[PDB]
Design a protein around this ligand. Sequence first.
Ligand SMILES: NC(=O)c1ccc[n+]([C@@H]2O[C@H](COP(=O)([O-])OP(=O)(O)OC[C@H]3O[C@@H](n4cnc5c(N)ncnc54)[C@H](OP(=O)(O)O)[C@@H]3O)[C@@H](O)[C@H]2O)c1
Ligand SMILES: NC(=O)c1ccc[n+]([C@@H]2O[C@H](COP(=O)([O-])OP(=O)(O)OC[C@H]3O[C@@H](n4cnc5c(N)ncnc54)[C@H](OP(=O)(O)O)[C@@H]3O)[C@@H](O)[C@H]2O)c1
Lengths: 412, 409
Amino acid sequence: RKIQGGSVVEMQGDEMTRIIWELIKEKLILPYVELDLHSYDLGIENRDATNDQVTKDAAEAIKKYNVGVKCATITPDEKRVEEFKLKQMWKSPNGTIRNILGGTVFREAIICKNIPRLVTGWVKPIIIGRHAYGDQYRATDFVVPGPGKVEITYTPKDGTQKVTYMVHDFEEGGGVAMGMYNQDKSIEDFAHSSFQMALSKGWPLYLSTKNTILKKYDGRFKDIFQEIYDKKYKSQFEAQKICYEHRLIDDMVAQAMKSEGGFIWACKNYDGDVQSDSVAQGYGSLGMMTSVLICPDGKTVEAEAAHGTVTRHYRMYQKGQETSTNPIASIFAWSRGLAHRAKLDNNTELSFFAKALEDVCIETIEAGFMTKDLAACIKGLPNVQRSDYLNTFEFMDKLGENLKAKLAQAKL
Amino acid sequence: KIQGGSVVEMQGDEMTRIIWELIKEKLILPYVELDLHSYDLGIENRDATNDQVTKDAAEAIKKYNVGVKCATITPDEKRVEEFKLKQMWKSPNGTIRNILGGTVFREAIICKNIPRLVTGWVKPIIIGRHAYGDQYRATDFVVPGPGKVEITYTPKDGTQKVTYMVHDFEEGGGVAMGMYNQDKSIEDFAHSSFQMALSKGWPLYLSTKNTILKKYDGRFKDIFQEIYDKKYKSQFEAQKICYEHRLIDDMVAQAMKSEGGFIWACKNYDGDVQSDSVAQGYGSLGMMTSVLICPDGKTVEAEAAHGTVTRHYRMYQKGQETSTNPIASIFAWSRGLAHRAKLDNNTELSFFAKALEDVCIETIEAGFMTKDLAACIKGLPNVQRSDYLNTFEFMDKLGENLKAKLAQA
Ligand SMILES: NC(=O)c1ccc[n+]([C@@H]2O[C@H](COP(=O)([O-])OP(=O)(O)OC[C@H]3O[C@@H](n4cnc5c(N)ncnc54)[C@H](OP(=O)(O)O)[C@@H]3O)[C@@H](O)[C@H]2O)c1
Ligand SMILES: NC(=O)c1ccc[n+]([C@@H]2O[C@H](COP(=O)([O-])OP(=O)(O)OC[C@H]3O[C@@H](n4cnc5c(N)ncnc54)[C@H](OP(=O)(O)O)[C@@H]3O)[C@@H](O)[C@H]2O)c1
């Protein structure tokens, strides 16, 4: 009989990842695990259909059952509005889910011994702790239509002084403007998650900001981290002989590039987004990275691929060009989500299944069966033959065969 | 000595200040006579003049069209205490760029014997960094407690004011900020980017986060596309190159895995961050050029992209030997003087500028380099003192080779 897995919130997505997502459920999950699957279609059409209510409903469900596994989703701009005949330019479902749940998105490469990196020195893992709240991802932006002043105003609840700051006086023509923000409590949760992750790994921690330029905004991050360190984690850090350091983002990305890895990197929301993809590509592929939102309650997680819907491959798929999209990141959303589900329930069999799922992925790749992106890592793109890799369906089938075999052995 | 002409010089801070004088003393003035308009943008003098020296320097560049700037300290609270400053002064770079406008073009300085950290970059990556607006001319503040932050637009013509909610802080405080950009600046940004692509013969990529900042970043995307479809597309096809917008996180990955050989138009912030990422990728922050090209097509400001290298300066203060790479600071002068030459049809200064650059590359390729470059070759753990020269040892070697090169031609 199948493993009794419990309640998991599933969020279906878009385009190429939507296709892969179904193959994963059919070939790797459902045959072995029976889940109370709370499914929410976060495909762009359904979101438009529900006026994005389905996205909010999914986030609330994650609060209830403590485990979310999410497929990559289209975040629409004008072109997407035209493409799907949308009612509105809906906000990022990820931004909405993260805004509701809070926490830190931890991202890390998935490493195979036979895959060369683009960055020579990274023999140890780099873990990015991405602050999941605020800044650009909950901003209020608009087009400035012509000459006029933009100002930003603070009005305290407590009737004290109201303050108006000049943003810019557009003397001729227009442009754009935006306001963005963050909250002390969220920054504090972010700091705590960062120090704790470093202590659990036994690695140094770095925070990057641009506090020289955003003296107040980014200065707040810097101050809160330092304060929380001096009060809560300093002695613990000293005991494990690791350090915490603040660096300017400029300096930090250069430092990361030349390091050997083996550190925790606390990033502001935007930096965490951009640099996690830089790092993932650095180790080999966007297809080879885990991403898990760890919420402040220490119980709730949302696992996801860090990459998008892989539109370009999807276009190929729509035109019958054979595709070779890497499913590993999407598979690890399931394994990481199921592993947490297992941990909460002390579900030994589910834990075993989740690790076995990950082992199958690594073993299969290390045995020389891989998608084109990984084959490109080994051979270099110009040297890649069709014989060097498997197409998307072939690779999924190969994983399914290897998983079946591995789970069959273990039972014997 | 060569008669250079009028150049605006800006002195800086810490390690780069030292190097800056070494450069002038050995590599420039011994060969070039300059109408040198010097401004001390050191932290001490900026404080002394209430940062007026920085604005004066900017106006000077506009007048004489050539500026060469040394790296400067941008003060935060720690700098305020360290130097007992009157105020937390704004970045002199931000101030200068805000006045001059333009695009900061950044690119690695390549030596054949220096291994990269990124295996695939056999061709160069040129970043065009929009030098105006966004985070670098923003208004930020601490939110002291519960309350609402709103952003408002008041039309100049007296029509209806518009107010947007930024955030209602219901519990505790936080931070907030407003930032902006201008259509004309974005347009100049676009033009400078397409033109650079065409002059280099390479494809052009613009990165934004327009899926998230739909209005703000969408404007950048729309302005680039419009200008492309109307002035540069035909030329692009004719050179068999192309323009493409990408989301920033896609772009950084694409860049990481590419062979190089493209122009990368970045918003101010991305240009800042990714230029350091790329410089380090090719080998060293010390090995990158940075040139602000102003929208008038005649004014230029050259600089090092890296900072004042405070950590090396700290060792220097404690008497320890330092090995800081001067090449970027040297190229600030060479790029500045080279532009000065093009302006004045000065064929003898153009030669000197090129000669200064060739001497740097020749010397490094001959096995004489600072510790950072030696670490590229051997690996940091395997570097020994015999593998490199200290800052002053290296500057002297450059001094000799320069003179010989000039003599021979
Ligand atoms: N977490 C999320 O829900 C999320 C995150 C990012 C983007 N998105 C959305 O996804 C859509 C497409 O965005 P995008 O094209 O900028 O980024 P993307 O979907 O991540 O893909 C961009 C490029 O990255 C490479 N790539 C990403 N995942 C890959 C994989 N699994 N296997 C092999 N290669 C992979 C491919 O490179 P090559 O083309 O060179 O082969 C692909 O064309 C957009 O609508 C965006 O809003 C969603
Ligand atoms: N253009 C500018 O005026 C500008 C730009 C950036 C920063 N800054 C200012 O500079 C100060 C220090 O900033 P920061 O320490 O974050 O950055 P930084 O001075 O650029 O460099 C920090 C690290 O980068 C490496 N590095 C940079 N330039 C180098 C060179 N020429 N040769 C060898 N190594 C080099 C060193 O690495 P290792 O320690 O590993 O040896 C150094 O410790 C700050 O006050 C900042 O405001 C100014």
